[PDB]
Symmetry: C2
Subunit: 90 residues, 2 copies
């Protein structure tokens, strides 16, 4: 078995590696929120591939601007976190 | 500010809610890996929307089968986790 990152087309992998570096430097500092963000970007990329898009058609040429639009807050993480607890009750 | 989940088209939100329930019952039990998986599915959905796809064009009609293909292992989480540490050095 292998990481789904390794299953991306090569172009997508190159841009993902740029992304990991960037987000480390400007994204959430916390390990878990950091991986949540990365996981999310990975899914953009996976659906991009499946849709027959080139990576820059997903991010645009300004990849940092793409990342920046997902870091504006942590409401998204917070939602997913709170929902999982509400369930773990179940 | 609001969760990006709330910014999805309504059809995508409906299928995401089905997904949260399903994954809770069959997905990783661990809180963090669970949110990582959810984050990833969310990105599939976000790129689906941006690409002009209907949700079932992203998941297929067998939504449980879609979820099942992302739960076959945790190599993907493990990768993202190990990479973040290697960096937090930096």
């Amino acid at each position: 078995h292998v990481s789904r990152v390794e299953k991306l087309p090569k172009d997508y992998q190159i841009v993902y590696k740029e992304i990991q570096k960037y987000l480390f430097k400007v994204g959430p500092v916390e390990l878990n929120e950091g991986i949540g963000l990365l996981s999310e970007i990975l899914g953009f990329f996976e659906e991009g591939a499946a849709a027959g898009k080139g990576v820059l058609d997903v991010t645009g040429t300004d990849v940092a601007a793409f990342c920046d639009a997902l870091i504006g807050d942590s409401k998204t993480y917070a939602d997913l976190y709170q929902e999982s607890i509400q369930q773990h009750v179940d």
